[PDB]
Design a protein around this ligand. Sequence first.
Ligand SMILES: [Zn+2]
Ligand SMILES: [Zn+2]
Lengths: 645, 145, 48, 48
Amino acid sequence: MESHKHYTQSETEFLLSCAETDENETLDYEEFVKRFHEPAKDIGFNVAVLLTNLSEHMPNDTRLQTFLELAESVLNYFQPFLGRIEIMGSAKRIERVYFEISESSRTQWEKPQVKESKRQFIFDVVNEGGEKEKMELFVNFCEDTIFEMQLAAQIMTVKDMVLAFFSSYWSVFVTLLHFVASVCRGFFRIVSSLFWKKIIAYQQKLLNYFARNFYNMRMLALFVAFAINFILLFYKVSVHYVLEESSGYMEPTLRILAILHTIISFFCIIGYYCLAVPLVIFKREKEVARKLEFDGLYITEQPSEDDIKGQWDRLVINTQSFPNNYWDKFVKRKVMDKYGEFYGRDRISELLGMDKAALDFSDAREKKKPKKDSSLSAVLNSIDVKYQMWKLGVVFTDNSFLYLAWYMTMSVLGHYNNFFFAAHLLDIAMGFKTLRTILSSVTHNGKQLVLTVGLLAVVVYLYTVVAFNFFRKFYNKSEDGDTPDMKCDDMLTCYMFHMYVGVRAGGGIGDEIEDPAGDEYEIYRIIFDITFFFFVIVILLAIIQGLIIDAFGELRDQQEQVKEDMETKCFICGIGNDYFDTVPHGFETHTLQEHNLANYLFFLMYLINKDETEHTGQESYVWKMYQERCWEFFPAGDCFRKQYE
Amino acid sequence: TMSVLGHYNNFFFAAHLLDIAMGFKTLRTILSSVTHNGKQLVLTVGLLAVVVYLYTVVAFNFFRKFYNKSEDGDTPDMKCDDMLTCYMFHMYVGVRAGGGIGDEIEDPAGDEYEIYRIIFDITFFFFVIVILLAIIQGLIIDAFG
Amino acid sequence: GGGIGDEIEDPAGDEYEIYRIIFDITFFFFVIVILLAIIQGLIIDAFG
Amino acid sequence: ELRDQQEQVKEDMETKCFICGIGNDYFDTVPHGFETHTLQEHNLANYL
Ligand SMILES: [Zn+2]
Ligand SMILES: [Zn+2]
């Protein structure tokens, strides 16, 4: 403690006197910290919040500043611990509320996935987001981010050149084999031990490991697919396909690599169920619960047959574990209170479930209460079946799970035929986002491209009928002479010939057909050919190239618009850069300290996870207003600096 | 070093013409249109390689009697019988052919494969040298803007 | 239109197959792919 | 050019009023001011 030289002589002697020194000159630093740090942390945080409030609300006070200067030593400890939100409390009053931000929350906020999600949310709310629902979208994004952060926290050289290129990857193959051996043999003595406690605590750990490493094994599967497809470049025909292109050591490694790829694909499809299924289930439950509470979907506004989501979300509202992932349970009671007198007192509860359960609870509120017993190997009756089946239906409807199912199916078929592994190269497009900047230039228009090819087909069809009617003696692609075939004698044959030859010929259709020297048709067929060239492969491929090029510019313009809006406006109050740019570095300080989106998200987390009973006045106000989902507590066009001097 | 080697072989002085690019800034306005994206261009060529590889395996599995570039007749060679040979043939001929890959291979008149190989060829043309060179040209053009 | 390999003998001679393939494909990709695209891009950018 | 025309139309209709042409900034002092002005006070449908 004296080598650090943070503590002076007085402090060191004080702590040495405060030591236990219980007749052994030995102290338990664990219990010492446990008794002398946590209450100190709590009271110090409260004092820091009080001093920060006094400083921010009592400016230009030298008497307060002199105290703050000596108080700075402890005030800096809680600097990355206290948030600050500017809300609208009393009528026309921008109140600055303070709260605590947990280290776990701040750690999970800086994860790259969360940052990318926030960037995408900002992008697609600036571009196509509205104004009446900006705070709606922001609160939805905040709720999803809080749920996912909690989930994450709770967890001869033409042939030999390629041979030489792959021979350098044995150094990676051997370490992959060592990694899989440390699991199949080094972990076997633990995974095959010899009860329920020690098996559940292990299966939960394994599921958490898969959820943690879901993406890393996606990369691993991609690399294994590349290796398989590279070693597939050594095949020869003899009706029989043979891999005889090296000095052995490839025929068995291909099979073991295919087996490894299938195993990794299965582990990916089971890790997705642990990582991303809870998030989509949370979103679905939140959506259906809010529809029930604020719209009376299955009460007054029965969903139509157009949407399957509404129909499939009908057999979930009547189960007991309905809000399994919504961090609240007072939704059935809320809707019962809202529609219990306007509609059937029992007719609401019969289709919301727990009707007999409500009657039993009312009866048991009297002097009638037994003790429930728990029996091992007898939880199949305890677990819900209807809710699980609804969840399975939602999962199998989910698109991202279907992609992994198709991936697994192709991997399985790769064993039957050792070429379906080529279909796994499509994961670089349908999967990772490293090629999105290029594939977006094609998929941005999309409909325009297919409309262009349809127009091309129609124009070629018109030219085809014109050729069929007026040009007989020209479509005479005969080989060696006196063997006329592949002619214009059939209408569909001519259409196929046009679409397949004239479009790709590069020089129209006149470069693949006889010389137009026959009388009375020279100029007519010259016009025909030159117009084909100028209309089909001059201003119809130029249209496709123009669509592709314009997609790049449109995406760049969208990105520039997002950057412009986020640099010259505030996301929450939307006042403007110029007003805040009067104090040196004003706008950046306003967007980093006063109106921080991360701070607002942390405040929402604090309200949700703190409690219901000991909210302060501002916390209770904001909580009630968030529960009723109206949101004028978000500063609309005002801030603290506009409110005061 | 190149100047010194030019004395040993009087042709390494051709490597000094690269100083107009790596040196003086008179050509920066033009070379920036290529080097501004850069990573996008190599990603595009990688995607082109992957698409041509997929088409190569499809051709290897389903089109045997077509890759028959025999000269003077009865001398079959340069075929699709080898997977890497077919991939090399595709990358080296179909990409640069200007008319897809159907303009360098036999006429698809064989029964039960006419429409299938027509679809194969037209899709090669429309995906590889229509909207994949257009992507490269669009990157080059967008760099200017 | 197809580089320089479409006007010259087939690169089947030993010890030069891959080298001349690289030569031809690089000619195609550098001279008539991103060097005529530069001219077309200049023409198009002038309009804008 | 067509994309620029569409963007210009959207820009004008989002930062100006069709009738009085005052501007977005003046009305954006009351919460949701410009939208209320363009939906209730100076509605083209209302004038028709
Ligand atoms: Zn603000
Ligand atoms: Zn107006």
